[PDB]
Each structure stands twice: as structure tokens, then as C-alpha cells.
RNA sequence: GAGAACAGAAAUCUCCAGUAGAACAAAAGGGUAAAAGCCCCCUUGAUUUUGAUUUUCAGUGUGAAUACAAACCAUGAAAGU
RNA sequence: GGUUGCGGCCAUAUCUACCAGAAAGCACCGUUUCCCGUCCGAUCAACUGUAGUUAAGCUGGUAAGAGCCUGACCGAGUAGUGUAGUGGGUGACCAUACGCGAAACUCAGGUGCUGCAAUCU
């Protein structure tokens, strides 16, 4: 992970860095080898967390494309 | 985007002083140099100083008695061509240049529309860069006039995908190995079904190969050689359309078929074993080589570039009769191959155990060297047109450059971010293009082991790449159903 | 008539604005283009259409006013084998290809040199006052100059066959405009339902019996001859310039003197 | 002399004025639709009065322009109603001439009860060939003086075709 | 709405500045010889120039209010005014303004031997390239008016600023030399003005890197004598040389890497 | 033929402007307005300077790239560019430096206490019945909704609401003008 | 100006004459006419990522505002804006 | 010397009225099947160079036709504005100085030059 871009239900929790369900986070995607038009190399994108990671350990997220 | 760190304050205050203009002072305190070739020649005691690096060339021309070009180098320590004293008796090594310059391929011509499925295979005509063939994920192949960037002569006649296309080494017919286990031949200028679909295999066709022109009977035409997923290797004569005689040695699927300079077919298969067939012995394997641990993909010969054109040199001319044609073809093969006077064609193997092997199947049945260092399977390997450089691509995003005579390690070409599917050499053996699972194509300058240009423009993966013979165009295509030509 | 004070007041436009040939708003955007990053020269390919002529010129501006590098005119197409239709799509294509191949040769590419590299030649399209329509024959010259091996940024929205609601090109309809295919469809379509307007139109065709096939067959050989010889051999130019000078000093009118107007006034006052 | 400087016609213009936007305007457009084979346009106002019972931008008038053969076709067909009667005026200083009539049904057209009785206008503008010198985009110019069209040229061109009268000076 | 806010905000004081625009003003006493040089001086300043057509009666060394008004109107920092008379024939006035107020003014006077591209052997040069510079003679480093002439011609004939520069643009050099040396007290010697165009050949004494260059004279060719001046006040000098303002033991390494020393 | 030439006092360079400064010795009796050999001296005393200057310019660091045509920025792979240093001569500006620091009494009130600025995230709000995202101001803003409500439930109240909004708008503009006059 | 059925002082239609006496985010000595005027086509924008100014009590790697820069974004055949 | 394409200066290049134009080119001019646009193939697009035309377009000349500009010792280094010695002032502040420093009438003259490329009885 690289940042917590936006957490619903408050901006204070976005500041504190909380990872509840629905949070939007920024992940490093150099392992997927994405190239943009003009030939640059993406290494950071947005994903949404899709579980309550207080009822397990994993944080599960879906990329935003 | 991510930025290079800006220069400091003291660095800005440094960059304003006067700075370091060289002068070439006098400069002939003469050093005795040793003119010695690569193969065997050491030709003989001359003591010049700081003279023109293009006058060393003329020295060698007048000495070896030809007035040709020569490239130079020294002290094979960092092995670099007054420039021998600015950084620091001293020797001199040279190689022949065969000057025919190929400008890089930078721009992008029009993205030609075409088939309705992905594009699987592509090939360039050996006689002119004006025509070019592509077999695609539909049941057809297509011919493209690269002169005007336009289509032509779509060749319907299969009913499953076309997995390999080949243009005969005389520029007379084109062959399309397909998924339905048929094999069809077509006329360039007409587009008519030249007979019916040859067949005899139980599963799909993997690779094709042709008879090299310098061995074909003048007054006749070359023959075929076909691999198939079933395991058979079949021969074909393109006048009677009859299966001459098959070969059934391997046990798993067979990947690739070759054809040497003395009439020795080589074949690597998914059975982890490379077999050396024969044509003067009616097709009984005479050598089996088992060195790999996993299965083998894309074997490659030392002269598979000269054996691909067959008397159509880089100047686009044509032959009128098999008499002159055979002499031109023999001259080509000898120019490419004769670096000691014998038939010293080597072979390189690429297998799924991350390692390549350097065979000389004629002289022995042992590998000369084991080339290693990759970290995932090696999908493709290739020899330089002059035969003294091996390039290898792999699914670990890298490309590696080896010394093609004994099998040392030279360099790595980083820059792709996904798997490298295949590579290709230019005519003068100085550039190298490569395609990858991500969009971009990359052009590398071998003379310095760096990246020359990086060209995007596709939208999905790219499966084929083919540089022309005179270096005028580069063709590519893949998952986005468009053909693409790149020029200088 | 006109008010003398108004005529003393009003100001005149530029000469070439008066003779309405030049577009001085486009010219600023096309000459003072960037122009704050570096100091790199900027050539420009111009293409012009009169009646019975296709003109192409690689123009480079300057302080003194302009310079021309390489030019091409459609009226040379017989030298390579095209006699009919010297103003159509195929003629525009051939002229573009010819100018591109000629300048490519003259620059010394095939058959301050520090930091060595060929550095392909970049030029731009000076459309002048031509209207931009999908299919116009000012983009055919562009296509030809590009396929000759020159580099001219462009797009496809103005090539024949671009479909609007589905933004993609069509290859075959484009290929059938490089070889006069439209004119040949016209010929084969009109050769039946009319013969009056097949002997009136295409009247020059019959005096050599060029049919509905050899168009595509001669255009290719024209391209081959062009790529073989762009060297631009001039005209022999009979009647060395002095002859024309003495000839057209005859029909040339002439002014008068001051002692001529000086006597006519007294002649009037006497009359 | 007249090598090619004849006095051919250019175009006919029709017109109907209705200070409203209603079924009157719709059928006034319809008659032009069915007559000229082309489609007619509407034209708005430019500023209000409030005395003539109108507003601004009310799409007042309908009209069509017709060139070629269908210009002279109506130019002739609409003459029998005026019965060849054209005065000195209804011409112009530039020779442009026209008139205006009533009772549409006097030429071909039937009644179609739900149209009404619609009166119309006419017009014709003349030129010697070479009308591009002003309408072209490049090197746009203005015609000379020997080539201008005054009243005499046009009135003789009229006392050439259909040989109508002078009708009061 | 914003098409006028744009033309308004273009004329705000910026941390990094844009090219200084030049204004060409023919006074009341203008002649044809004097006016066939304004065009040749605005050629080498194209495109950042603007010329007024008719004559404007402004005497600069008495009342400069029309000059400052023209500055504030035309949004041009430079001013070249053309005048002629018996006491001063072929007089040109060079003004540069600061904050729509006068900074310094200087008169120059032309001789009779000027030259034009209608006189010379014509050569080529693209419209908009940045010229080179040469200032010969040592008086430009020490003497006041000779410092002023250099600091004026640089400000006038340099155009854009750039960090990267292509080499196909280096195509002409401007040069200024004092006519001979002098001891203090003597009149201020004449300053010349020359414009050339380069050409380079293979050398063989310096490899393919350094060539042997050659010059050709294109035009113009002017001489200049000093007239009246108006020098900058100390406050304005200290207010016109200001850097816009945009760490011990702390360094930035390559790769980023803010680092610190501990000693 | 020589690409070099010597001069006693070293030329000073300004590569940030492509400028040379020579300070050697001239000869008063060579450049006089009538000397025949005048141009053949000017054009050479300047040619040696240009030679030194090209020598200095052709030895700077070069900046290559790997891009290709279409690149939105500038140069491509087939252009080497010289990295010019910065100029040194103090040439004067044309306008003073920009500085305007007024606190407008809101930056004073908000700073005496701890009112921090807002995050400036987005412009949309969520309408509840209906179910859209309805810009707070920017298209049919939630303000201009009591205007077209189909009944208000208490003179027309909607027009009074419009007037009450306009009063605050005009007060804000007046406050701004007062602050700018301070 | 001169003309076209109802048509007039002010309704619509057509030809020869504003160097601008109209309309211009707008006020000018001077500008805007193949537009900065009037029509038609395509479209977001309070985008995202670190150096200068200040301030956070979870002193808090950007956490946010703020100034500037770059990658993008829109349009165009393009030059470019 | 004409004509065409692209240009610098931007009325010595314009507004007005007649006259001449051989060859080459420019134009008017011939047509609507295809790409493309309009109420209308008029302008914009497409094709042949085909049936005609030198009438306008275009260039040039002429005119005590209107506009425009050039130069001169035309004014004159003067009027105008600034200091000065003691050049004077009950109060009113007033004459010829060195350095800045103008226009209208006067006189004479003109009514397009120039860069690159191709070509033309």
C-alpha cells in the first residue's frame, strides 16, 4: 500500500489511516506491468477494500480500472 | 510523474567555469602496434602514433591487399575499440564490417486494419519489402502491400486458425500451416488455391521449414518440412504434392524443424531430446542429444538467416536462371559460414529449464558450453546473421547477449516490464528489435548494449515481429487485430 | 463618389491580403509556432491547386522572405507515364511521392555532423485557403509525401472511407483511390448507358485506347519509375532568355516623358 | 460584341409572409414543399413594435430559391396569371425584376381544402456568365463595368422571352 | 468572460519573466534613410516587436510622460525612438522601462556609411532563432556608458531563455567592438555593430568533433556615437536586480535520499 | 585550418546567453572610418572569438532520450541537446517582484483561533429522494430548489428566499471591497 | 439607394455602396474584418505528485491548505491554442 | 520582359474613368457515378482538359481626376523654455546670452520596388 486516499463516513479517519470496508487505497502495481499510451510505466493505482479486516487478517481489494 | 533529483547549488555554481576542450596536441610519439585478426591472422610490426582511425582501415586494406572496411578494438581489458591514451605496448584486433548501413526504425506508419481475430504469425518476403504475409486468428492469411500501406489478396481456404506462415526461399509460393491439420500453398501474384490442402498429420502443425536453395537441383524447386503436435516430421515436394517420407522418432509433441547447410535436419521436441535426422539416409535419425531437464522450445541454427533468403541479397535484385541463382546462393552461404574454411555451423537450444546449450552436432555429440543465468523459461533464441552473437529472450522480462563462438556472457538488455516473447536482428547485425507481452516494442543498439528507442502504439499483447531484409520496415501485430509497420 | 477626408483617413491592408491569396492569421501560428523551448529550424511543405496543375514546394521562411528547397509540378507526370487526369487523386499522390523521394535523395540518405544520426526530415502541411473535407485531394498529396519517406504529422479523419458514427478507417476504399479506381468505376459504369458522354468525356482516352484495366497497371509502374529517378532533369529551354526579352519588349507598353505632358497642356489650352 | 457575354438568368426566389407562427405558417411551408420539390425555411423578426400584433423571433416568413431549369419553369408558368402584364417599375436599377400574385390554383395545383388560398411572390436576378469572380473564396474580386447589368439590358432580355409588354412606361 | 481577464493577467508581475517587447516610435523628424534602418533592426527582433505608423511628437529629455504612457499601454519594456536634426542627425533613442516608469535612456548617432540587406550579398537565416554574441574591447567591463551599452544590447537581442539548446539553431552572431582604446579624458570612442552568419568545414586537425568555422557578412553594418544619457538611480538599481527567492550538514543525494552529517 | 587560436588575456564566457567577452588590446589606428584594411581585421578579430566560443559550446553535457515522435514535450531520440549553464550577468527585471500580503480580517479571526482550511475534496452532495448526486452549486444547485418546488407551505415565499440570498451575496461583495480598500 | 401580392413610418424578399458611425467580462492615445462580432460541431476541470510560505498535539513522510513545475486532459488535418 | 506559386516592406502599392493585350500560364469556362454540404452542385467537393472565350477576371498605359509620399540652408538654428556674472528693478519685473530647440505657407520631385523556384515566341 502507498496511501489511504479516502475513507467513507469521515475525513478524520482518512487522516488517521483507518482501513475499514469501502476504503479507497493506493497500491503499487509494478508487478502487473502496465504501460500507458506514450510509453510510460504505471506503478501506482487505486483499489477498494472489499471486506471487514477486523474479522480476519487479510485486506482484500479490487483494483479500479 | 517521478522526477530525477534536481542539481544542487554548488553544482550550479560549478557548471559555469571554463571547461575542458581537447586539442590533439602533436601527436606522434609512435607506439608499435600488433595488427592481429580474430580467427587466426596476426599480420607486421608498424609503429604509428595518433592517426586517423579511418586511416588504420586503409593501412589494413593496402596491407592485406584488397584496395574494404574494418572495425577495430584493443586488449581483449574492457575490450573497447589518442582515445587509447586519453584515459590511460598495445595490440590491435579487427573484424570485417561489410558496410551496408541500416538506420534505426523510429516512427510509426499507419495501423493497418485487417482480420477479425488476433494475429498469430507474420513474415516478410525475401525479395522485396513491398509485400508481407500475416496469418491471423481467423481461418485466413492476408498479404499486405507495404509500399502503400494497403491490403491485398486475402487467402481464404482453411477452416481453423493459421498458426504459421512461411514464404519460400525463392519468392515463389507461400505455405500456411493451420489448426485443422491441412497445409496449403498459395501464389503471391494471383491468390488462387494452388491445388488442394496437403495433409497426413493427426494434430496441428507447429512449424515449417524449406530446402535451402544452394542444394536444390537447378531446374527444380525446393521442398518442405513440417512439424506437428502428433510427433511426425513430414517431407513434401511441391510439384507432385506427395508425402515423400515421414520421420517418427520422438514421443511427445515436436516444436521446431530446421534444415542445415549439409542436409541435416535438426528437431527439438517436448521429449527433452534433440534429434539429428538425415536426408541422404532416407530419414533415419543418426544422433540423439539429451542434456536438458525440461522440454525444448525454438531450437536455432547458426546460418538460419542466410538459409532464409537464398540469393536475394540486400540490394533487391533477382536471378533469371537457376545457374546464376545457385552460384549466388553458394556465395551467400560461404560468406556467412566460412570463418575457418569448414562447415562450422553451430546450433543453440532453448528449453524450459532456464538454460541453453551450445551444440556443434557435426564435430561431436557433446555440448561445447552450457549458457545459464536466466530465471524463467527461455521462449526464443537467435544467432546473428554473421554468426558471432547469440541473443536470447525469456519470460522474466530480460534479454541476454552471449558471445556466439564459445558461449560466454556479454550483456543483459533490461527495459521491458513484462515477458519478452521474441526478438529479431537487423541486416547489418547492429540493431535488434524485440516484442513483449505488454504493448511496447524496443530497439536495442548492440554496439553499445543500450536502449536506442522505445516505440508504443499497440493496445494489447504483441505476438510477432519481423524486420525486413534491407532494413526498410519492421512489421508487428497481436491481440488488437491491427497490423503495424514502423519505419525510420 | 467618395469623401476626400475619408480617403485621406482610411488605411490599406497588406498587399497579399488585398490580392486575397495569403492568410496572415494562419501564417503567424504556422511560423512563430512554439517558439520558446529551443531554436530549431522549421520547414513547411506547401501544396497548391490551380486548374490543370498540382504544385508542391518545401518552403523555409527567413528574414529576406522565403527560400525553396524542392518543388514538384503535376505537368511532369508524362515523363513517368501518366498523360490523362493530371489533377485527380492519383496525380496528387504521384506528385507527393515524387517531391518526397526527390528531397530524400537530395538530402543524401540512400544511394554539423557531431552527435551523428540521420534525423528524419520533418515538415508540415500548409493548406492555404483550401477547405478541409474528408476526401479532398489535398490530403492525397499528404499521403503520397508520407509514403515517399517524409515525416508529416497527420490523422485519418480526412481520408476517403472514414466512417463517422464508428470511428475507424476502411482500407480497400482508400486503396481504390490511389489507382484512379473511382475514375475507372465511372468509365465502366458510363460506357454502357451513354456513349455521347463517353465520347465527350474521356475523349482523350480513345486516341490511345486506354481501358478500364491499365489505369491500376500504369500507376504502379509510374511509382516505380519515380522511385528509380527523382533527379529532376530540367527543360532544355530553347530561345535563350535574351530572345524572350527582345520578343516581349515589343508587346510591352511604355510610359512617356515629362516634356510630353508639358506640351499637351498648351495644346489643350489652344484647342 | 457578345463572344460569350450573354445575359442568362441566375435564379428564381419565392416568398410568403405571415406575421404569426401557426397552421398558416405550416401550410405556407407545405405549398412550397410540394411545389419546389425542396424544403423551405423560416425567418424570424428583428425587433418588436407591439402595434402589428407580433413579437420578436416569431419565424415570420417562408421562402425557397430555385436555380437552373426549375427557375425558368416557374418563371414562365406563373406568367399567365399576370397575363404578361409587367410595368416599368417592378424592375430595378440592377435589372432584378419580379412581381406577386394571388389565387394559386391557376397553374396545375389543386385545392386540397385544408390549405386555403395562398398568394405568392416572385423574383429574378440576372448575370452574364462569370459570377464566380465575387462568390469564390480565393482571389475574390468585383466585376468590371462593361459587364454590369443596367435596366436596358434586362428590359430587352425581357422583350426577348415571352415578349411581354411595357405596361405604362 | 475570461478573454479579458486573460489579457489582464498576462500583465502581472511573475516570479519568472517572459520576453521583453520592443516598441518602435518614429518621432516628428524622421527621414527615409533613418526609416530604412528601423525595418532592419526589427527584423532581428521579430516577432516580439510592435511598430507605430504615424509620427509622435515626444521630446524624451524634457517630458517623458508620453513614453511612460506608451509603456503602460502597449505593454512593452523597450523603446526605440527615431529622430534627426542638425545638432543630432540620425539620432536613435534607446529606452528600457521598469514598472511602467523610466529606468535609463541613451542616445546613439549613426554615420553615413550604413548598409542594408538591399546592399549586401544575401544569405539565409530562419525567423526566430536565438543569436550568438561577441563583445570585443575591454571597456565594456569597466567604463559606465560602455557597461550600459552592453547591458542594453543583451537585454534587447537575446529573446527567450532556455536550458536545452539544439545545434541546428546556432546560425548567426552579433558583434560589438569599441573603435580602438583610449585614455581617460578623451571623447568616448565610436562603437561598431556587425551581424554575420556561420559556416563550418571539415578540419582534420580536430576530428569530427570540432570543425573550422567561417563567417560571412549579411547585414546590417552600423556605427554608433554616444549622445545624451539618463542613468538609473541607486534605489531603482537595487530594486531591479532581485532574485525571486525560489541547509548545513544536510544534503540531497542522487536517488533522492536526504542525508545528514554527524561530525 | 587550425580549430584553435591563442590570445593573451583569456576570453570570458556566458554560455547561458551564448556570449563571449574579449578584453585584449585593440589598435586605435586599425578600425578608423577610412582605413582600407578594416573589414579584413574586424571579421577576423571576431572570427577567433567565435572559434573559441564554438570550442566552448561543443564540449557541454548532452541530453539524449528514448522517446519517439508524437511525444507531447519536445525532442525525440534523434536529437542531442546541450545543457546550457545559467547566466551570470545581473540583467535587470522589467516589473518588481509580486508581493501582496493582506489578511482581510478573516485570516486574522481564523488564525487567532484555530480554524483550519477545508480539504476541498468535491462539489457534489447526495440528495435523498431523489437518488442522485445533484451538485451543491454547479447544476440546479441545491439552493435553486426552493425556486421550483411545487409547493412551499409558507407574498410569495420563494421570491423572499431569493431576495434573502441576494442580500448575503451583495454583503459578501461589499466586505471584499472594504478589505481591499484596507 | 433602387426594387418584390395584401405591405404602410416602423413585418418579409432580393442586388450595389460602414475601414467600422454596432457589439465589444471593459474605460482608453491607439486596437479588434477570412474576427476578439454573429452562427454551427466536439467536450472536462474543486484532475494527481514533491521543492518554497504556515500549522498540526498522536511532531503526525504529506496530513491539509498555499505558490510554482511536470505528467494528463479538451480540441484541431496540423501548426498549435 | 510577361505569367504562376510562396514572401519583405504594408497607399511611391489606393478610390475613379477609358484603352491594349500576341505566346505561356491564370481565369471564366465543360459535366454530377463515386467521398463530402447546403433551401438551392450558387459557394464547398468530385471528373475530363474534354465543346467554346479573351468579354469581364489579371497586368500595363493614360488623367493639369481625388489620396499619398520624398527632399531643401521653406522657416532657422530662429519662435518657444530653462540659467547667468551686477544687466537694471519704492512698488510693476523687466532687453541682447551659451547649452535644448519646432510647424504652415515656399521650392523641386515621384505615383512600386525588391527574395526564392519553375517557365514562356
Short mmCIF file of N, CA and C in Angstrom, two decimals, chain D residues 73-161:
data_model
loop_
_atom_site.label_atom_id
_atom_site.label_comp_id
_atom_site.label_asym_id
_atom_site.label_seq_id
_atom_site.Cartn_x
_atom_site.Cartn_y
_atom_site.Cartn_z
N UNK D 73 -38.82 27.46 -65.36
CA UNK D 73 -40.08 26.73 -65.44
C UNK D 73 -41.18 27.49 -64.71
N UNK D 74 -40.95 27.84 -63.44
CA UNK D 74 -41.94 28.62 -62.71
C UNK D 74 -42.01 30.04 -63.24
N UNK D 75 -40.87 30.62 -63.63
CA UNK D 75 -40.87 31.96 -64.22
C UNK D 75 -41.88 32.07 -65.36
N UNK D 76 -41.98 31.02 -66.18
CA UNK D 76 -42.97 31.02 -67.24
C UNK D 76 -44.34 30.66 -66.71
N UNK D 77 -44.44 29.54 -65.97
CA UNK D 77 -45.75 29.02 -65.59
C UNK D 77 -46.55 30.02 -64.77
N UNK D 78 -45.88 30.90 -64.03
CA UNK D 78 -46.56 31.92 -63.27
C UNK D 78 -46.83 33.21 -64.00
N UNK D 79 -46.75 33.20 -65.34
CA UNK D 79 -46.96 34.41 -66.12
C UNK D 79 -48.39 34.58 -66.59
N UNK D 80 -49.10 33.48 -66.83
CA UNK D 80 -50.45 33.57 -67.38
C UNK D 80 -51.41 34.26 -66.42
N UNK D 81 -51.09 34.24 -65.12
CA UNK D 81 -51.96 34.87 -64.14
C UNK D 81 -51.87 36.39 -64.26
N UNK D 82 -50.64 36.92 -64.28
CA UNK D 82 -50.47 38.34 -64.55
C UNK D 82 -50.83 38.70 -65.99
N UNK D 83 -50.97 37.70 -66.86
CA UNK D 83 -51.35 37.90 -68.26
C UNK D 83 -50.35 38.80 -68.99
N UNK D 84 -49.06 38.51 -68.78
CA UNK D 84 -47.95 39.18 -69.45
C UNK D 84 -47.82 40.65 -69.07
N UNK D 85 -48.41 41.07 -67.96
CA UNK D 85 -48.54 42.49 -67.62
C UNK D 85 -47.50 42.86 -66.57
N UNK D 86 -46.43 43.51 -67.01
CA UNK D 86 -45.35 43.97 -66.13
C UNK D 86 -45.00 45.40 -66.49
N UNK D 87 -45.04 46.29 -65.50
CA UNK D 87 -44.84 47.72 -65.73
C UNK D 87 -43.35 48.00 -65.91
N UNK D 88 -43.00 49.29 -65.96
CA UNK D 88 -41.59 49.67 -65.93
C UNK D 88 -40.99 49.39 -64.56
N UNK D 89 -41.58 49.96 -63.51
CA UNK D 89 -41.24 49.51 -62.17
C UNK D 89 -41.67 48.06 -62.01
N UNK D 90 -41.27 47.46 -60.89
CA UNK D 90 -41.08 46.04 -60.65
C UNK D 90 -39.79 45.56 -61.30
N UNK D 91 -39.12 46.39 -62.09
CA UNK D 91 -37.72 46.19 -62.44
C UNK D 91 -36.88 46.88 -61.37
N UNK D 92 -35.59 47.05 -61.62
CA UNK D 92 -34.73 47.71 -60.65
C UNK D 92 -33.55 48.35 -61.37
N UNK D 93 -32.77 49.13 -60.62
CA UNK D 93 -31.57 49.74 -61.17
C UNK D 93 -30.53 48.71 -61.56
N UNK D 94 -30.62 47.50 -61.03
CA UNK D 94 -29.73 46.40 -61.39
C UNK D 94 -30.40 45.38 -62.29
N UNK D 95 -31.61 45.67 -62.76
CA UNK D 95 -32.33 44.77 -63.64
C UNK D 95 -33.04 43.63 -62.96
N UNK D 96 -32.87 43.47 -61.65
CA UNK D 96 -33.60 42.45 -60.91
C UNK D 96 -35.09 42.76 -60.98
N UNK D 97 -35.90 41.77 -61.35
CA UNK D 97 -37.31 42.03 -61.58
C UNK D 97 -38.18 40.89 -61.07
N UNK D 98 -39.40 41.23 -60.67
CA UNK D 98 -40.32 40.25 -60.14
C UNK D 98 -41.65 40.91 -59.85
N UNK D 99 -42.59 40.09 -59.39
CA UNK D 99 -43.95 40.53 -59.15
C UNK D 99 -44.53 39.71 -58.01
N UNK D 100 -45.85 39.71 -57.89
CA UNK D 100 -46.53 38.92 -56.88
C UNK D 100 -47.99 38.71 -57.19
N UNK D 101 -48.49 37.49 -57.00
CA UNK D 101 -49.82 37.15 -57.48
C UNK D 101 -50.67 36.53 -56.37
N UNK D 102 -51.92 36.20 -56.72
CA UNK D 102 -52.88 35.57 -55.83
C UNK D 102 -53.48 34.36 -56.55
N UNK D 103 -54.39 33.66 -55.87
CA UNK D 103 -55.20 32.60 -56.47
C UNK D 103 -54.31 31.50 -57.07
N UNK D 104 -53.67 30.77 -56.15
CA UNK D 104 -52.66 29.78 -56.52
C UNK D 104 -53.15 28.79 -57.58
N UNK D 105 -54.43 28.43 -57.56
CA UNK D 105 -54.91 27.27 -58.31
C UNK D 105 -54.90 27.49 -59.82
N UNK D 106 -54.43 28.65 -60.27
CA UNK D 106 -54.40 28.85 -61.72
C UNK D 106 -53.23 28.18 -62.41
N UNK D 107 -52.49 27.24 -61.82
CA UNK D 107 -51.44 26.54 -62.56
C UNK D 107 -51.21 25.18 -61.89
N UNK D 108 -51.78 24.14 -62.48
CA UNK D 108 -51.52 22.78 -62.05
C UNK D 108 -52.13 22.41 -60.71
N UNK D 109 -51.79 23.19 -59.68
CA UNK D 109 -52.11 22.82 -58.31
C UNK D 109 -53.61 22.73 -58.10
N UNK D 110 -54.03 21.73 -57.33
CA UNK D 110 -55.43 21.54 -56.98
C UNK D 110 -55.74 22.34 -55.71
N UNK D 111 -56.89 22.06 -55.09
CA UNK D 111 -57.32 22.86 -53.96
C UNK D 111 -56.78 22.33 -52.64
N UNK D 112 -57.04 21.05 -52.33
CA UNK D 112 -56.71 20.46 -51.03
C UNK D 112 -57.29 21.33 -49.93
N UNK D 113 -58.61 21.27 -49.69
CA UNK D 113 -59.31 22.27 -48.87
C UNK D 113 -58.55 22.78 -47.65
N UNK D 114 -57.84 21.90 -46.95
CA UNK D 114 -57.07 22.31 -45.79
C UNK D 114 -55.71 22.87 -46.15
N UNK D 115 -55.66 23.79 -47.12
CA UNK D 115 -54.51 24.67 -47.33
C UNK D 115 -54.98 26.11 -47.34
N UNK D 116 -56.05 26.38 -48.09
CA UNK D 116 -56.61 27.71 -48.18
C UNK D 116 -56.41 28.33 -49.55
N UNK D 117 -56.28 29.65 -49.59
CA UNK D 117 -55.95 30.38 -50.81
C UNK D 117 -54.73 31.23 -50.51
N UNK D 118 -53.60 30.89 -51.11
CA UNK D 118 -52.33 31.50 -50.77
C UNK D 118 -51.78 32.30 -51.94
N UNK D 119 -51.51 33.58 -51.69
CA UNK D 119 -50.81 34.40 -52.65
C UNK D 119 -49.31 34.33 -52.46
N UNK D 120 -48.58 34.61 -53.53
CA UNK D 120 -47.14 34.37 -53.56
C UNK D 120 -46.41 35.57 -54.15
N UNK D 121 -45.09 35.52 -54.06
CA UNK D 121 -44.20 36.49 -54.68
C UNK D 121 -43.37 35.82 -55.76
N UNK D 122 -42.53 36.62 -56.42
CA UNK D 122 -41.59 36.15 -57.42
C UNK D 122 -40.32 36.98 -57.29
N UNK D 123 -39.29 36.57 -58.03
CA UNK D 123 -38.13 37.41 -58.28
C UNK D 123 -37.19 36.70 -59.24
N UNK D 124 -36.39 37.50 -59.94
CA UNK D 124 -35.36 37.01 -60.84
C UNK D 124 -34.20 38.00 -60.83
N UNK D 125 -32.99 37.47 -60.69
CA UNK D 125 -31.75 38.23 -60.78
C UNK D 125 -30.95 37.68 -61.96
N UNK D 126 -30.27 38.58 -62.67
CA UNK D 126 -29.62 38.26 -63.94
C UNK D 126 -28.12 38.44 -63.83
N UNK D 127 -27.39 37.78 -64.73
CA UNK D 127 -25.95 37.94 -64.78
C UNK D 127 -25.42 37.44 -66.12
N UNK D 128 -24.47 38.12 -66.61
CA UNK D 128 -23.68 37.47 -67.63
C UNK D 128 -22.79 36.41 -66.98
N UNK D 129 -22.44 35.35 -67.71
CA UNK D 129 -21.58 34.31 -67.14
C UNK D 129 -20.30 34.89 -66.56
N UNK D 130 -19.78 34.23 -65.52
CA UNK D 130 -18.65 34.76 -64.79
C UNK D 130 -19.08 35.33 -63.46
N UNK D 131 -20.01 34.64 -62.80
CA UNK D 131 -20.49 35.05 -61.48
C UNK D 131 -19.62 34.52 -60.35
N UNK D 132 -18.53 33.82 -60.66
CA UNK D 132 -17.66 33.30 -59.62
C UNK D 132 -16.69 34.35 -59.11
N UNK D 133 -16.42 35.40 -59.89
CA UNK D 133 -15.40 36.38 -59.54
C UNK D 133 -15.68 37.06 -58.21
N UNK D 134 -16.92 37.02 -57.73
CA UNK D 134 -17.26 37.58 -56.43
C UNK D 134 -17.53 36.51 -55.38
N UNK D 135 -18.11 35.38 -55.77
CA UNK D 135 -18.52 34.36 -54.81
C UNK D 135 -17.42 33.37 -54.46
N UNK D 136 -16.33 33.32 -55.22
CA UNK D 136 -15.25 32.41 -54.87
C UNK D 136 -14.51 32.91 -53.64
N UNK D 137 -13.72 32.02 -53.05
CA UNK D 137 -13.05 32.31 -51.79
C UNK D 137 -11.64 32.86 -51.99
N UNK D 138 -10.92 32.37 -52.99
CA UNK D 138 -9.56 32.80 -53.25
C UNK D 138 -9.54 33.81 -54.38
N UNK D 139 -8.80 34.90 -54.18
CA UNK D 139 -8.69 35.99 -55.16
C UNK D 139 -10.05 36.59 -55.47
N UNK D 140 -10.90 36.69 -54.44
CA UNK D 140 -12.24 37.23 -54.62
C UNK D 140 -12.17 38.66 -55.14
N UNK D 141 -12.98 38.94 -56.17
CA UNK D 141 -12.95 40.24 -56.81
C UNK D 141 -14.30 40.89 -56.99
N UNK D 142 -14.37 41.88 -57.87
CA UNK D 142 -15.61 42.57 -58.21
C UNK D 142 -15.65 42.80 -59.71
N UNK D 143 -16.81 42.52 -60.31
CA UNK D 143 -16.94 42.53 -61.76
C UNK D 143 -16.60 43.92 -62.30
N UNK D 144 -16.21 43.97 -63.57
CA UNK D 144 -15.87 45.23 -64.20
C UNK D 144 -17.07 46.13 -64.42
N UNK D 145 -16.96 47.07 -65.35
CA UNK D 145 -18.05 47.98 -65.67
C UNK D 145 -18.73 47.64 -66.99
N UNK D 146 -17.96 47.19 -67.98
CA UNK D 146 -18.56 46.76 -69.24
C UNK D 146 -19.49 45.57 -69.05
N UNK D 147 -19.33 44.86 -67.94
CA UNK D 147 -20.05 43.62 -67.69
C UNK D 147 -21.23 43.81 -66.74
N UNK D 148 -21.40 45.00 -66.19
CA UNK D 148 -22.52 45.29 -65.30
C UNK D 148 -23.85 45.15 -66.05
N UNK D 149 -24.93 45.04 -65.28
CA UNK D 149 -26.28 44.89 -65.83
C UNK D 149 -27.12 46.08 -65.37
N UNK D 150 -27.52 46.92 -66.32
CA UNK D 150 -28.42 48.03 -66.06
C UNK D 150 -29.83 47.67 -66.52
N UNK D 151 -30.72 48.66 -66.50
CA UNK D 151 -32.13 48.39 -66.79
C UNK D 151 -32.35 48.06 -68.26
N UNK D 152 -31.56 48.64 -69.17
CA UNK D 152 -31.81 48.46 -70.60
C UNK D 152 -31.53 47.02 -71.04
N UNK D 153 -30.37 46.49 -70.65
CA UNK D 153 -30.04 45.10 -70.95
C UNK D 153 -31.15 44.17 -70.49
N UNK D 154 -31.59 44.34 -69.25
CA UNK D 154 -32.58 43.43 -68.68
C UNK D 154 -33.95 43.61 -69.32
N UNK D 155 -34.31 44.85 -69.67
CA UNK D 155 -35.63 45.06 -70.27
C UNK D 155 -35.67 44.52 -71.69
N UNK D 156 -34.54 44.52 -72.40
CA UNK D 156 -34.53 43.86 -73.70
C UNK D 156 -34.50 42.35 -73.55
N UNK D 157 -33.76 41.84 -72.55
CA UNK D 157 -33.82 40.42 -72.27
C UNK D 157 -35.24 39.98 -71.98
N UNK D 158 -36.03 40.85 -71.35
CA UNK D 158 -37.44 40.55 -71.13
C UNK D 158 -38.25 40.69 -72.41
N UNK D 159 -37.99 41.73 -73.21
CA UNK D 159 -38.62 41.80 -74.53
C UNK D 159 -37.81 40.96 -75.50
N UNK D 160 -37.34 39.82 -75.01
CA UNK D 160 -36.93 38.69 -75.83
C UNK D 160 -37.78 37.45 -75.57
N UNK D 161 -37.96 37.07 -74.31
CA UNK D 161 -38.65 35.84 -73.95
C UNK D 161 -40.07 36.15 -73.52
#
